[PDB]
């Protein structure tokens, strides 16, 4: 299982 989230402001 591979769960990824990224935020760029």
From Swiss-Prot:
Coiled coil: none annotated. Monomer and homodimer. Has a tendency to aggregate into amyloid fibrils containing a cross-beta spine, formed by a steric zipper of superposed beta-strands. Soluble oligomers may represent an intermediate stage on the path to fibril formation. Copper binding may promote oligomerization. Interacts with GRB2, APP, ERI3/PRNPIP and SYN1. Mislocalized cytosolically exposed PrP interacts with MGRN1; this interaction alters MGRN1 subcellular location and causes lysosomal enlargement. Interacts with APP. Interacts with KIAA1191. Interacts with ADGRG6. It is linked to Found in high quantity in the brain of humans and animals infected with degenerative neurological diseases such as kuru, Creutzfeldt-Jakob disease (CJD), Gerstmann-Straussler syndrome (GSS), scrapie, bovine spongiform encephalopathy (BSE), transmissible mink encephalopathy (TME), etc. This is Major prion protein. Disruption phenotype: No visible phenotype. Mice develop chronic demyelinating polyneuropathy after 60 weeks. Mice show abnormally low iron levels throughout the body, and are mildly anemic. Iron accumulates in duodenum enterocytes, suggesting impaired transport from the intestine to the blood. Mice deficient for both Prnd and Prnp have the same phenotype as mice lacking Prnd; they are born at the expected Mendelian rate and appear grossly normal and healthy. Females are fertile, but males deficient for both Prnd and Prnp are sterile, in spite of normal mating behavior. N-glycosylated. It is found in: Cell membrane; Golgi apparatus. Highly expressed in the brain, lung, kidney and heart. Expressed at low levels in the liver and spleen. It comes from the Eukaryota. The chain holds residues 167 to 175 of 254 of the full protein. Belongs to the prion family. The normal, monomeric form has a mainly alpha-helical structure. The disease-associated, protease-resistant form forms amyloid fibrils containing a cross-beta spine, formed by a steric zipper of superposed beta-strands. Disease mutations may favor intermolecular contacts via short beta strands, and may thereby trigger oligomerization. Its primary physiological function is unclear. May play a role in neuronal development and synaptic plasticity. May be required for neuronal myelin sheath maintenance. May promote myelin homeostasis through acting as an agonist for ADGRG6 receptor. May play a role in iron uptake and iron homeostasis. Soluble oligomers are toxic to cultured neuroblastoma cells and induce apoptosis (in vitro). Association with GPC1 (via its heparan sulfate chains) targets PRNP to lipid rafts. Also provides Cu(2+) or Zn(2+) for the ascorbate-mediated GPC1 deaminase degradation of its heparan sulfate side chains. It comes from Mus musculus (Mouse).
